[PDB]
């Protein structure tokens, strides 16, 4: 009944080894540790993914390329921003992939009902292409592992960006339903995920996309999320949940799009947790490093049912938490561009889609 926390010092080191979002994994763990939350969790060392395990989703060519350049340093694999240093990407991918598979296996084995991998959630990676800071799609690997036991998986993606890599992976199946809430605007990455994108073939109506505009705040976001998830839960009756909680929705993120705080995301998390299903918790985006640690530490508190002290405790990264040194994040003074009539249209459209879903 205690949550599983996927962690080792070696894993945190590997997760920070590419320095794409410098030291973020260490900041997140260090803040969790400073609040002593790890003492309330079952700490599990992640396994490293085998080639075979990564190949349940990624192509041999892509994986063999990563392994080759790990040894020796031309096809487009999405690696063109990594020329100064590609040799570490294979081990990074095997670590992230293994950690999420380990979390999924803990759920399968009934070790826990909630398993956390805050340095996973890399939802944009394609079978044969890195994308959007994602080199391996560990979320897909986790869902595939859960499908060995659970007959219907719900994937919920609350990252600022559309979870295109995961949606695409399961587009043709009705056994995995993907739900993504995200900014959707012409020109905005990755460009996919309009409300009319509902999946394909046998998977038609088993993808759910909620396009949202700049400036959304906690209350309206939760109303939208609760509305959709209530309908999804009734229609699809999931047996396990994978939840991606990218913190690039949070006020202060350089993405500067949504205007959320961790309390709003936490209400979404609480709604999902009260289903009492096996739940795999993942991180993802989050580019204000201190705020991302604030967010995921607060959400770890939510999982544990604990109220955390407002004051950030002294720890390795304490200087980064200025100028106010508190856990709470204040929304930015920016307008909400979400008009109530369009949001209601979107909800109504999704309701119509979900009427088709029959288990
Ligand atoms: C500078 C920013 C634009 C940054 N990008 C980059 O640092 C690089 C590596 C340098 S230039 C570039 N990528 C680029 C050109 S076109 C394109 N990216 C489309 N991809 C995105 O916009 C993803 C997007 C990431 C989204 C997080 C998804 S959780 N990236 C970025 O915010
Ligand atoms: K999303
Ligand atoms: K699907
Ligand atoms: Zn994102």
UniProtKB/Swiss-Prot annotation:
Reported tissue expression: Weakly expressed in most tissues. Expressed at higher level in heart, brain, kidney and pancreas and also in liver, lung, placenta, prostate and kidney.
InterPro entries, A to Z: HDAC_PDAC (IPR050284), His_deacetylse (IPR000286), His_deacetylse_1 (IPR003084), His_deacetylse_dom (IPR023801), His_deacetylse_dom_sf (IPR037138), Ureohydrolase_dom_sf (IPR023696)
GO CC list: cytoplasm; histone deacetylase complex; nuclear chromosome; nucleoplasm; nucleus
Domain of life: Eukaryota
A GO biological-process term: negative regulation of protein ubiquitination
Active site residues per record: 124
Modified residues (Phosphoserine): 26
Segments forming a coiled coil: none
Binding positions for a divalent metal cation per the UniProt entry: 159, 161, 248
Reactions accelerated catalytically: N(6)-acetyl-L-lysyl-[histone] + H2O = L-lysyl-[histone] + acetate; N(6)-acetyl-L-lysyl-[protein] + H2O = L-lysyl-[protein] + acetate; N(6)-(2E)-butenoyl-L-lysyl-[protein] + H2O = (2E)-2-butenoate + L-lysyl-[protein]
Protein name per Swiss-Prot or TrEMBL: Histone deacetylase 8
């Amino acid at each position: 009944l205690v949550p599983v926390y996927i962690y080792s010092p070696e894993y945190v080191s590997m997760c920070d080894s590419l320095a794409k979002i410098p030291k973020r994994a260490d900041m997140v763990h260090s803040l969790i540790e400073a609040y002593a939350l790890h003492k309330q969790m079952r700490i599990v060392k992640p396994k490293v993914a085998s080639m075979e395990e990564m190949a349940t989703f990624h192509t041999d060519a892509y994986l063999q390329h990563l392994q080759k350049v790990s040894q020796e340093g031309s096809i487009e694999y999405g690696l063109g921003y990594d020329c100064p240093a590609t040799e570490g990407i294979f081990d990074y991918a095997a670590a992230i992939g293994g950690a999420t598979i380990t979390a999924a296996q803990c759920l399968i084995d009934g070790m826990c009902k909630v398993a956390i991998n805050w340095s996973g959630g890399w939802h944009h990676a394609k079978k044969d292409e890195a994308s959007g800071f994602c080199y391996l799609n560990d979320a897909v690997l986790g869902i595939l592992r859960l499908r060995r036991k659970f007959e219907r998986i719900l994937y919920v993606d609350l990252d600022l960006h559309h979870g295109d890599g995961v949606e695409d992976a399961f587009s043709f199946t009705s056994k995995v339903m993907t739900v993504s809430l995200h900014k959707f605007s012409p020109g905005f990455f990755p460009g996919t995920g309009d409300v009319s994108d509902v999946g394909l073939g046998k998977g038609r109506y088993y993808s759910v996309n909620v396009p949202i505009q700049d400036g959304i705040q906690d209350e309206k976001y939760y109303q939208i999320c609760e509305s959709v998830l209530k309908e999804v839960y009734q229609a699809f009756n999931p047996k396990a949940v994978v939840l991606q909680l990218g913190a690039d929705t949070i006020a202060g993120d350089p993405m500067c799009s949504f205007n959320m705080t961790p309390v709003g995301i936490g209400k979404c998390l609480k709604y999902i947790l009260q289903w009492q299903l096996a739940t795999l918790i993942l991180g993802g985006g989050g580019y204000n490093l201190a705020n991302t640690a604030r967010c995921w530490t607060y959400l770890t508190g939510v999982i544990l049912g604990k109220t955390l002290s407002s004051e950030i405790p002294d720890h390795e990264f304490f200087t980064a938490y200025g100028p106010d040194y508190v856990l709470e994040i204040t929304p930015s003074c920016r307008p909400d561009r979400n008009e109530p009539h369009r949001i209601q249209q979107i909800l109504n459209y999704i309701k119509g889609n979900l009427k088709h879903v029959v288990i």
